[PDB]
Write a protein that binds this ligand. Structure first.
Ligand SMILES: Cc1cc2nc3c(=O)[nH]c(=O)nc-3n(C[C@H](O)[C@H](O)[C@H](O)COP(=O)(O)O)c2cc1C
Ligand SMILES: Cc1cc2nc3c(=O)[nH]c(=O)nc-3n(C[C@H](O)[C@H](O)[C@H](O)COP(=O)(O)O)c2cc1C
Lengths: 147, 147
């Protein structure tokens, strides 16, 4: 009994490590960051989405300037997953998967304005910010569980 | 008329370009290759998947040795999207998106034998081949269509 109980302490520690790892990877805004989505007909999509910021422990805000299909999918089904994949293109791989649900679709506010400030310091500064998408974090997994 | 003919020609040249770019990137088997899937409840998953081969213009075969959730999703909905993304020192290099539908899940035959040979020459050589997944290619898009 206490052996299972100790394994749970352990698992909460693992979740905290994964959260902090996710925080650094997401806020780093690597160009190798994607968001996968789906429409009502089960057509899965994936697009590169890097203008991001993780707020607190359960929220990611995202700059939406392109991503037409990705945005449409989120409005229809609401579910998605972010992946930050880092690789040497040789032997090495690292990263994180953050499973998400769209919480808000904003055109103004401090969230809209803060992500707008972040967008202004990027190559896509010249692309009009159409939306600031707010996501709720559902689960964080390592890049690939392999037993 | 003339517009419809020239446009049909443009589409054909474009399609061949997409098929060839996809062929090269898929068959190279980069670490930075993924398969995004979904279940009946619209929950989207993404996993790293590089033991792959594109055959002709309509087929992708893939070794299934890990990827449990990915596999369960494919059996529920059958839909997915592969993405290859090359980035060098956080500089965008190239990539492709290949949209697919599961056609077959096999344990023997030409496809199984083919993907087995490939897997033998990998770090995952010791991982047993549980399935040869056969995909039909449904659409190929460039990485981003941002204007
Ligand atoms: C570089 C790399 C390539 C991989 N290629 C494959 C593959 O071709 N087929 C497979 O079944 N698993 C492959 N894996 C292992 C899966 O990514 C791993 O089993 C993962 O946990 C599956 O995630 P899932 O449970 O969300 O489906 C690969 C892993 C890495 C790091
Ligand atoms: C490195 C990189 C980062 C990008 N980041 C974003 C982003 O943060 N938000 C966005 O809307 N589009 C971004 N894009 C553009 C989308 O990927 C592009 O609009 C894509 O075609 C959308 O795909 P979709 O129509 O299937 O949703 C980025 C593109 C690149 C190459």
């Amino acid at each position: 009994g206490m052996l299972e109980s100790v394994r749970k302490e352990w698992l909460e520690i693992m979740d905290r490590e994964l959260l902090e790892k996710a925080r650094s990877l997401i806020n780093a805004n690597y160009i190798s960051t994607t968001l996968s989505t789906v429409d009502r007909n089960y057509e899965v999509n994936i697009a590169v989405i890097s203008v991001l910021e993780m707020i607190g422990d359960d929220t990611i805000i995202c700059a939406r300037f392109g991503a037409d299909k990705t945005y449409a999918n989120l409005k229809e089904t609401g579910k998605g997953v972010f992946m930050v994949l880092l690789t040497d293109n040789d032997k090495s791989k690292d990263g994180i998967r953050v499973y998400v649900e769209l919480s808000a679709d904003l055109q103004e506010g401090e969230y809209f304005d803060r992500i707008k400030k972040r967008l202004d310091n990027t190559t896509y500064k010249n692309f009009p910010l159409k939306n600031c998408l707010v996501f709720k974090i559902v689960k964080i997994l390592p890049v690939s569980l392999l037993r």
